[PDB]
Coordinates of C-alpha atoms in Angstrom, one line a residue:
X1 CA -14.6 -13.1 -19.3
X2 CA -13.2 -9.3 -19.4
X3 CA -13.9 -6.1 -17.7
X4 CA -13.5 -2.4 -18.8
X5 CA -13.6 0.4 -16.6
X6 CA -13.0 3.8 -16.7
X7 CA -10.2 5.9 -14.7
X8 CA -9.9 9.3 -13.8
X9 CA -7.2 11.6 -12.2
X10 CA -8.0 12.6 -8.8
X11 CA -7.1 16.4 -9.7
X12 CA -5.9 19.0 -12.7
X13 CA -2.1 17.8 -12.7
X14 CA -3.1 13.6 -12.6
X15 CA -1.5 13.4 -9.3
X16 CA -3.3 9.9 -9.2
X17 CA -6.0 7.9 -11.0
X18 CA -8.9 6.4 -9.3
X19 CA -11.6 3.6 -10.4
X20 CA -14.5 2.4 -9.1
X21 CA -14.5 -0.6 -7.6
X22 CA -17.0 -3.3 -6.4
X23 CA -16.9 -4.8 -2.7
X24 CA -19.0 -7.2 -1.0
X25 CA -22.8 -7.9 -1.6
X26 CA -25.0 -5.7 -2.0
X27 CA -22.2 -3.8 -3.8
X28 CA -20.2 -1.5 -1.6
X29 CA -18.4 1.0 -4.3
X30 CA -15.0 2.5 -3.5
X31 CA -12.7 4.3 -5.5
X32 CA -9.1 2.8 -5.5
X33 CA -6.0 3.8 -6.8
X34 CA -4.6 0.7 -9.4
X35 CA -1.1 0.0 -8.3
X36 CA 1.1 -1.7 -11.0
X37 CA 4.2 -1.3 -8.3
X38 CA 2.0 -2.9 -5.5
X39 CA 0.2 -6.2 -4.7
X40 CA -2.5 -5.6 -1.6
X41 CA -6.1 -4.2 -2.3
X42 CA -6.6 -2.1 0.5
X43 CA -9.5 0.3 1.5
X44 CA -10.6 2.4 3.7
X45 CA -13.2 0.4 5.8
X46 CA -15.3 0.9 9.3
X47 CA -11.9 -0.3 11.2
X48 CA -9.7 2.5 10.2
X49 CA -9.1 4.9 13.2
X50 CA -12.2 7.5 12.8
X51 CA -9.0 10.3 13.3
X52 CA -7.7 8.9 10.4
X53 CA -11.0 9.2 7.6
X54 CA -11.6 12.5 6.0
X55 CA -14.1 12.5 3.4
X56 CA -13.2 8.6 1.9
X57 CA -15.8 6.3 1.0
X58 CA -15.4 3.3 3.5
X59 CA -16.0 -0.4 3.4
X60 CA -17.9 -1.8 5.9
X61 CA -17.9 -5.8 5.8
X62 CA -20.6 -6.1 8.4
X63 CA -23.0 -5.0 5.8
X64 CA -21.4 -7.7 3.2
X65 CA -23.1 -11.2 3.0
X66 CA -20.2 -12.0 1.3
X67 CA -17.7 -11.2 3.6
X68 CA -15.8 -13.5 5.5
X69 CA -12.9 -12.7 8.3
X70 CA -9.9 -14.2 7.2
X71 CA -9.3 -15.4 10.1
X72 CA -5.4 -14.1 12.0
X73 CA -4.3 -12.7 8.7
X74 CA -2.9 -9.1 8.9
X75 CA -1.2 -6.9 6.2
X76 CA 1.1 -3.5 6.9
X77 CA 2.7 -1.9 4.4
X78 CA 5.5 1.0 3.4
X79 CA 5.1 2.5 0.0
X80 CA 8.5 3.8 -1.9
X81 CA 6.8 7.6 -0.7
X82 CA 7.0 7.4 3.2
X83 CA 3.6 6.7 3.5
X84 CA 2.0 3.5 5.1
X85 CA -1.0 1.7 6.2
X86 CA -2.4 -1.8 7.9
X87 CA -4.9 -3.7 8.8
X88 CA -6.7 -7.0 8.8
X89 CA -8.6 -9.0 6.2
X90 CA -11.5 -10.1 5.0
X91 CA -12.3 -12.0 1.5
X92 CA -15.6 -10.9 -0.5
X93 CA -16.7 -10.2 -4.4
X94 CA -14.9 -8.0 -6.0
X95 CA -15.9 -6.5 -9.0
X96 CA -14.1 -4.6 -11.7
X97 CA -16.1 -3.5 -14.7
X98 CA -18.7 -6.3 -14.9
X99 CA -15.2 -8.6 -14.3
X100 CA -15.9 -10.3 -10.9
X101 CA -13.5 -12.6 -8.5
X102 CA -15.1 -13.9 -5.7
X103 CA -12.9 -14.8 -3.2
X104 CA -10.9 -11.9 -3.0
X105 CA -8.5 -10.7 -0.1
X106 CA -9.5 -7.4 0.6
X107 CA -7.3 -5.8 3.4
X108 CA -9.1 -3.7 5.8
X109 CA -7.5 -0.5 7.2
X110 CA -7.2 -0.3 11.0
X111 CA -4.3 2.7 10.3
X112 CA -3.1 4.6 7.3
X113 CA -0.5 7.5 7.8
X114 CA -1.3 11.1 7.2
X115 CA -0.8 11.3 3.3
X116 CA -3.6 8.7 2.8
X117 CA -5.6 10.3 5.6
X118 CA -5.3 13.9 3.6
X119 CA -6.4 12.4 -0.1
X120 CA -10.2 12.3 0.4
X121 CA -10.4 11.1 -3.1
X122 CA -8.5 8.1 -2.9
X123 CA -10.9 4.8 -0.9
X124 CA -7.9 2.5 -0.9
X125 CA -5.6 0.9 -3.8
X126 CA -5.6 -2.1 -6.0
X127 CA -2.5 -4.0 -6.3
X128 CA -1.2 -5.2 -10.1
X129 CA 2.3 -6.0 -9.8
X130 CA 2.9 -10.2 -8.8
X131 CA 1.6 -11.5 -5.9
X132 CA 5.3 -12.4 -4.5
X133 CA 5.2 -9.0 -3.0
X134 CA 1.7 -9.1 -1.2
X135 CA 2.0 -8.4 2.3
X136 CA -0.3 -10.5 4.1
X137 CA 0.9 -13.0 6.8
X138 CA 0.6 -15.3 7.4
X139 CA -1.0 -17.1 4.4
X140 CA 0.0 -14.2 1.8
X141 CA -3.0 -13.7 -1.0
X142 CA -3.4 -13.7 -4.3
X143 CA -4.3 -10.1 -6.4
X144 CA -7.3 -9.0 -8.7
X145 CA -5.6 -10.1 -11.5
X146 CA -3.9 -13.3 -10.3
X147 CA -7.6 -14.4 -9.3
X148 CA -8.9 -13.7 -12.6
X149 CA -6.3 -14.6 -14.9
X150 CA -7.8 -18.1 -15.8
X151 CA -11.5 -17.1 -16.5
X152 CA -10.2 -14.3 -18.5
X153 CA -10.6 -14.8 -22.5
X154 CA -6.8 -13.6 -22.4
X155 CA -4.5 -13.4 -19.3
X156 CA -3.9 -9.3 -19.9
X157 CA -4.8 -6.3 -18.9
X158 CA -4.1 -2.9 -19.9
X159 CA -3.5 0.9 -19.1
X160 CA -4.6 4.0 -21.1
X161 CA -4.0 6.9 -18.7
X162 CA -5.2 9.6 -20.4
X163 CA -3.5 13.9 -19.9
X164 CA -5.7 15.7 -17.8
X165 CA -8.2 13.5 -19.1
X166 CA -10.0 9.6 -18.1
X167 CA -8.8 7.0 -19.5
X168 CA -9.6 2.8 -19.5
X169 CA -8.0 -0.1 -17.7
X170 CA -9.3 -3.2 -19.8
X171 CA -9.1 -6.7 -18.5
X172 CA -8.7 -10.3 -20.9
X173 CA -8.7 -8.2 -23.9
X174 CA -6.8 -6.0 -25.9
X175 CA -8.8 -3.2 -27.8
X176 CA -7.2 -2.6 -31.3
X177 CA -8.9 0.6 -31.4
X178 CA -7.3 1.9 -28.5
X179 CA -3.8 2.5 -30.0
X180 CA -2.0 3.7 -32.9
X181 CA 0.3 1.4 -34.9
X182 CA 1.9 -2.0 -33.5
X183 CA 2.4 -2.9 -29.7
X184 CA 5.9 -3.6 -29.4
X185 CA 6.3 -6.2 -26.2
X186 CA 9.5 -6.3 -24.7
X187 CA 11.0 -8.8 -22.0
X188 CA 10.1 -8.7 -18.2
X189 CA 12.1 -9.7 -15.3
X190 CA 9.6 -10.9 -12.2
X191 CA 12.6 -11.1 -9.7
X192 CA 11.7 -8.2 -7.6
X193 CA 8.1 -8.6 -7.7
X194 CA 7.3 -5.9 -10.1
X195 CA 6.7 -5.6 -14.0
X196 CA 10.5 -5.0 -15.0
X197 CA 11.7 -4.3 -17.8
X198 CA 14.4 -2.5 -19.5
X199 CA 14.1 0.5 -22.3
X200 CA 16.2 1.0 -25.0
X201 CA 17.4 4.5 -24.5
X202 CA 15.9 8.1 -24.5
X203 CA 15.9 11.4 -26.4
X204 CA 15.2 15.3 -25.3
X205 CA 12.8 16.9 -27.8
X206 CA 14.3 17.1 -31.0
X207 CA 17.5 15.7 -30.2
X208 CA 19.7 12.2 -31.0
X209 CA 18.6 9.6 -29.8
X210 CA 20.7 7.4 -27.3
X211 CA 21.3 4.0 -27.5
X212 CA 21.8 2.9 -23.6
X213 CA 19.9 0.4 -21.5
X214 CA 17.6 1.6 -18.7
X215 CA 15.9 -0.5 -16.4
X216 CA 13.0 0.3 -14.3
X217 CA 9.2 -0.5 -13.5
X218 CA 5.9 0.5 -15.1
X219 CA 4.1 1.7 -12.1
X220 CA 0.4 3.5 -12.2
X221 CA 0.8 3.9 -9.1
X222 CA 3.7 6.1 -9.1
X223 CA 2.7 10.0 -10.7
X224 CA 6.5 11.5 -11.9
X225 CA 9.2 9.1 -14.2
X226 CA 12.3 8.7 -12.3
X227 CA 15.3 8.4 -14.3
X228 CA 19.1 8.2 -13.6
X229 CA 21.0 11.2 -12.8
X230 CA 22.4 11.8 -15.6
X231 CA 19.5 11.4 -18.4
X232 CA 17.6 13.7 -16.1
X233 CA 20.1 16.5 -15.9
X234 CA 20.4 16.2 -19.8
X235 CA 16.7 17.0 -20.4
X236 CA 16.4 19.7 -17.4
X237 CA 19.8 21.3 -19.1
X238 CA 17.0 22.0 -22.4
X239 CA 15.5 24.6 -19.9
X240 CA 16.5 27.8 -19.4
X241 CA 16.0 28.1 -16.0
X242 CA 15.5 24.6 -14.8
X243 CA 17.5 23.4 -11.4
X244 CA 17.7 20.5 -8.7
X245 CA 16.1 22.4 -5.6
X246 CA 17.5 20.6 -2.5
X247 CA 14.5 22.6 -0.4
X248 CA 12.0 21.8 -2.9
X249 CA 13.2 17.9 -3.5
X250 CA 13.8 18.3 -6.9
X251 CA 13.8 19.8 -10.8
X252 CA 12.1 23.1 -10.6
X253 CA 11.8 25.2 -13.4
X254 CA 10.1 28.9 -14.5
X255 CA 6.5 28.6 -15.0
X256 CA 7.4 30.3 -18.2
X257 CA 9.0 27.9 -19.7
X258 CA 8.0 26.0 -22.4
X259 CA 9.1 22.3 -22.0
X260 CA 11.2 19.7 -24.6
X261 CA 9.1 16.4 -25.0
X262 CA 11.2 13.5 -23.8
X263 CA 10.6 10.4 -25.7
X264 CA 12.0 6.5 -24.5
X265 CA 12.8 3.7 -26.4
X266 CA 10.9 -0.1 -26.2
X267 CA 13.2 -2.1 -28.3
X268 CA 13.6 -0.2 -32.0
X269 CA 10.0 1.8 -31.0
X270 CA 9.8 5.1 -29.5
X271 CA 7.3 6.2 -27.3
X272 CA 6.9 10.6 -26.8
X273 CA 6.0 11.9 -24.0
X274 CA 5.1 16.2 -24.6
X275 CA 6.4 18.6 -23.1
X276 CA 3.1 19.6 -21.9
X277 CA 3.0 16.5 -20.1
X278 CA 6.1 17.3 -17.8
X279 CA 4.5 19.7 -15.9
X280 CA 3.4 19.8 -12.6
X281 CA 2.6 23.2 -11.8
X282 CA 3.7 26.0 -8.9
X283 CA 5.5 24.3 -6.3
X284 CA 3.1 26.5 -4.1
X285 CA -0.2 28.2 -4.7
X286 CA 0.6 31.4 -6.9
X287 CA 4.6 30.6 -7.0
X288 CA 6.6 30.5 -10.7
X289 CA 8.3 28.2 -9.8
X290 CA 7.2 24.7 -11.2
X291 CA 7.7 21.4 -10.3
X292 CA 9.4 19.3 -12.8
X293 CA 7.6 15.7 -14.1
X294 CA 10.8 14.2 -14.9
X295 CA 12.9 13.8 -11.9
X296 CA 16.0 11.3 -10.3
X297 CA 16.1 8.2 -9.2
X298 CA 19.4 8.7 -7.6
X299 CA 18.7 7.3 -3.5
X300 CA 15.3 5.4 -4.7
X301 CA 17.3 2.4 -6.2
X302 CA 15.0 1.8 -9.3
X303 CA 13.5 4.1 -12.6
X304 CA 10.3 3.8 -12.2
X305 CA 8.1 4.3 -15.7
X306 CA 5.2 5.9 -13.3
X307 CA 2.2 8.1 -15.0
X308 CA 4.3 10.6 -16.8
X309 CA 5.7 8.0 -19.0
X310 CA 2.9 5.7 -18.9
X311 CA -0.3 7.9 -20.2
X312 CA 1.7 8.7 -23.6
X313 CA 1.5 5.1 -24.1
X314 CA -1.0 2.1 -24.5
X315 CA 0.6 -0.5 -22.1
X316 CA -0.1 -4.1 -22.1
X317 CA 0.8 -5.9 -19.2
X318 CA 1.0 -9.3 -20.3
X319 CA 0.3 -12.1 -17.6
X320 CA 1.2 -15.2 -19.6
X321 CA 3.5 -17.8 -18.2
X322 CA 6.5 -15.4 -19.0
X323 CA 5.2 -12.1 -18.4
X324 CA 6.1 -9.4 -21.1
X325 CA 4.5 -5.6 -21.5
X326 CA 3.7 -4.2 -24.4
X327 CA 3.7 -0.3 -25.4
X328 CA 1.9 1.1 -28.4
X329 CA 1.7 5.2 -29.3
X330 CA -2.1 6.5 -29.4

């Protein structure tokens, strides 16, 4: 089998991508938030504390024939952001694109925290990294993809985040048309629970490459890449302008500006992000100052390959025996 369906960011600066999402019988629809860093499928639902809801589209498993309590399992979790949620769980049909588990954990919000409460646009999120790091207890579950793996024709999926644009997560098939070139894979470490791997080394717009090993995640769920200290400060230093804000919590730099691309290495590939791509507009409505898309990783403890890095790219998350992800330009 294989599914393919569409994904498009919640707003004008791709602060988040959302997909539609089947639950239950007849077919509730949410939109959810595909989580490469994360392992629980979570939604809104008619348990979350009605304070809590603002405009989300809820799941209500009362109105599933499908759905089944799951009986004493709970689920609470912390995101690397501050924010939270938790719940209990039912199992139901899930579909993604015409792909279809049944069976599915889906966690049911009782409480989310205030930054989930104030997205109306984003129903819940869909887990992709390994199911090591799913939070329910006390029989932890399997995600989307670790359900389907074995009925799809090939045990892959893939992200095409688009720029201010949709773009296509593809399940048990790679589509040759979707990229330019070759895919280069590259090796992934599984230890922490997240797809891991390790680039090759960066440049700042037209300059040298460097040759020096960075490890981090590839995370969809994550919006800005988050780099070592001193990488970042080496491409903010290409803009006039450009500082760390302590007050803001992070690079700022003058609207005005027009920014370097920063391209990363996957083995001997390269992939370029644009300049363009960087930017995350006035740090406040009608400021110019803006807030920077490249920023440090200094105090999270990992580089994390999130949207910025990922939508210049064609990524293949490879969910064979040994995991690898692949990265073509496009």
């Amino acid at each position: 089998s294989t599914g393919s369906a569409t994904t498009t960011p919640i707003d004008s600066l791709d602060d988040a991508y959302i997909t539609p999402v089947q639950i239950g019988t007849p077919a509730q629809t949410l939109n959810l938030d595909f989580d490469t860093g994360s392992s629980d499928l979570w939604v809104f639902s008619s348990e979350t504390t009605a304070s809590e809801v603002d405009g989300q589209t809820i799941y209500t498993p009362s109105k599933s024939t499908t759905a089944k309590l799951l009986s004493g399992a709970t689920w609470s979790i912390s995101y690397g952001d501050g924010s939270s949620s938790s719940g209990d769980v039912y199992t139901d049909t899930v579909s993604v694109g015409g792909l279809t588990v049944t069976g599915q954990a889906v966690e049911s919000a009782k409480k989310v925290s205030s930054s989930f409460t104030e997205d109306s646009t984003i129903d819940g999120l869909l887990g992709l990294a390994f199911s090591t790091l799913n939070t329910v207890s006390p029989t932890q579950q399997k995600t989307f993809f670790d359900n389907a793996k074995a009925s799809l024709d090939s045990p892959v999926f893939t992200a095409d985040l688009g720029y201010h644009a949709p773009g296509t997560y593809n399940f048990g098939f790679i589509d040759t048309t979707a990229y330019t070139g070759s895919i280069t894979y590259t090796a992934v470490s599984t230890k922490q629970g997240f797809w891991e791997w390790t680039s090759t080394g960066y440049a700042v717009g037209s300059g040298t490459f460097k040759s020096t090993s960075i490890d981090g995640i590839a995370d969809t769920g994550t919006t800005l890449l988050y780099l070592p200290a001193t990488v970042v400060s080496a491409y903010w230093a290409q803009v006039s302008g450009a500082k760390s804000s302590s007050s803001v919590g992070g690079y700022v730099f003058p609207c005005s500006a027009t920014l370097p691309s920063f391209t990363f290495g996957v083995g001997s590939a390269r992939i370029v992000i644009p300049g363009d791509y960087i930017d995350f507009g006035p740090i406040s409505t009608g400021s110019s100052s803006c807030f920077g898309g490249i920023q440090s990783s200094a105090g999270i403890g990992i580089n994390i390959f999130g949207d910025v890095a990922l939508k210049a790219a064609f990524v293949v998350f490879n969910g064979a025996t040994t995991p690898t992800l692949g990265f073509a330009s496009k």
